[PDB]
Ligand binder design. Structure first.
Ligand SMILES: Cc1cc(C2CCCCC2)n(O)c(=O)c1
Ligand SMILES: Cc1cc(C2CCCCC2)n(O)c(=O)c1
Ligand SMILES: Cc1cc(C2CCCCC2)n(O)c(=O)c1
Lengths: 141, 141, 141, 141, 141, 141
């Protein structure tokens, strides 16, 4: 199967990649934010939205990878192999979760279409060279 | 956060664990089944159901976990740890995906309440010793 | 005192012993089943039934013996003596708890009189030699 | 499961622990008292009350725990562990049965609410230092 | 700032010191009593009273000192320095918390003015030499 | 007991921790501010508000913690432990008092709901990278 997790939400993997990697917050900071803003609704027994259902699975999969790292470190008593697995996750998969977490959190706070219009505006703005581009970047509040 | 991926779908992790792990199909067989029955709807740009949204994220995360296992199998220096980490990924996180994939596929084909009634009936049936239990097990339809 | 825990529930220790010991599920499997079917009612602040009150005390006494084993193993640092205490419990008292747990769980799911009629029917059936006895045994279901 | 044997009887483990352990009678003395006051009803084929059902299971489990202690005292090879395991059974699980036996006997003789009001009054009284506390302690009526 | 924690409650540090230190229960016993009598209201989301607000901060500060002791003992692996910090707390600050805990608990159970009248009566009584003073001391109730 | 000092005031420990620790003023500066703005009311014999009662206990407990730190700095024999225990008191328990002092001062000057709305807005703002976030941060007034 060729599945795009953004496709049912009016976006695509390409559109998210349009933003530079450095622009996304850390996974840690996005999880703290998900809690801060939406802990009650995430843990609730209501399908509040597709964004909520998407966020739940993503948070639990990141959860599984962190349980694996801890398990390797303490249960296998092998911190070296632990450090390699953390390094592999952060290098190879961290960006994907950063994009996905940011996208679904941003979509809930600011609204879906606002986040889309913001991806195009910011990518244009950032690519425009410093001299040419307006000093005040596009904002979502 | 304490999130339960089954909680928004009227179930829980405990209820799913009530079925013995050996009685779930393989991940490979569930993915082929997901395709066989629902490839068009999974790949579509419509939020067909929370089951569809849940399945999409799970199917995509499994890809990443299998790339991790392969990577560990080639790249992990310590022979003691390596085979254990591959085994843990394939079987221990494998069981979670087997439960989740089976649950969401079963819920779409046969209906949510049918799947729930079936979990309780089968767990009781399987635990009942051979002599005591009916010869014909409970059937999903 | 000569107390029979089955006497207030229309049965006796003799009637329960009428079933072969091999016929009962494991303690572990009966506790998982008690949870699966009745966790909410067991933990509730209502005397739902004498079966519930009986189950609560039995589950907690098994609980106490398992806390003792763990305590011997980890707190006294003596796994050898741990293994002897587990072995003593499983050979000497496990059958009693298996009979009692099965009885009170079976009485709640299928109804008290049904379970009684089933004890007599099954004991007769199992004692009748293989050649002579019907192929389909009595079923509680 | 998190089961509280006092919860269905309007109390909790915390409330019972509010009384110092030294102020409960011996298990032996509570069993003799249970007999003295209620032998006929305990041994009867009627569910006289939840207190009666609770008492029956507790009295029967104490028998098993005392057979375990005796067995450990003769059969446990390791002298360090043996005396500690006997001591743990007699005193540490002994306190639980002392609390539970006293509670259910006291509830039958004096009434449930009277026993509850008495737990709070006595715990306050005993903790208040000799100088500060009234000479007449609370009495069970 | 010169702040008196008793001043807003119609008392002072001097008036509390009027009672001998030996008269107060242990911190441990007052915390168990605070729980026993008021766990629900202390943990609740209502400002039940200034006594409740005062008690919450005091219980949490004692909590912080006990987390420090544990941290020194286990995390710094230094039980010696642990023993010195516990000794310093118990000799230097324990009386203050004993006075404050007793005061706010006593004020809630027996009423504020009753506790005040009781401080003066008891201090007079205790200072009156044994021969001269009534045999029955003043009682809180 | 699980007590939250913010729970009575419509907030929680999690919500306060949402702000980075570095963005709170020093304890010294918050105490000078508490004096500057509210010395008369804090030292007064009126329960002006729950915020005032909370502040009084916290300000008095900080005194005791600073006497402990000084005492450890002169009197703790083990050089390894001593600097770590002073550092832990000043920074780690310091953060708790910084959060609590700031919270209760901010609640009195600007109003409770304003402070809450400000915690969420600022945490979001600070976590969102410079490029994404508005140049003007949220302001307390
Ligand atoms: C765990 C489990 C799984 C199934 C499925 C196994 C294979 C696919 C369809 C049913 N069943 O029938 C069980 O009883 C228990
Ligand atoms: C918990 C408890 C129990 C008793 C009973 C022990 C024997 C039966 C009557 C009292 N007393 O006297 C207490 O103070 C406290
Ligand atoms: C953690 C923290 C603290 C403050 C206060 C710092 C100074 C006192 C008033 C606000 N602010 O403004 C933040 O954004 C974050």
């Amino acid at each position: 199967m060729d599945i795009d997790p953004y496709k049912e939400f009016g976006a695509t993997v390409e559109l998210l990649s349009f933003l530079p990697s450095d622009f996304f917050p850390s996974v840690r900071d996005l999880l703290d934010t998900a809690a801060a803003l939406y802990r009650d609704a995430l843990e609730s027994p209501e399908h509040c939205s597709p964004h909520h259902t998407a966020l739940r699975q993503a948070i639990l999969c990141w959860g599984d990878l962190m349980t694996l790292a801890t398990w390797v470190g303490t249960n296998l008593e092998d911190p070296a192999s632990r450090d390699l697995v953390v390094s592999y996750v952060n290098t190879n998969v961290g960006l994907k979760f950063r994009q996905l977490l940011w996208f679904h959190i941003s979509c809930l706070t600011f609204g879906r279409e606002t986040v889309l219009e913001y991806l195009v505006s910011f990518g244009v703005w950032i690519r425009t060279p410093p001299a040419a581009r307006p000093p005040n970047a596009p904002i979502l509040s």
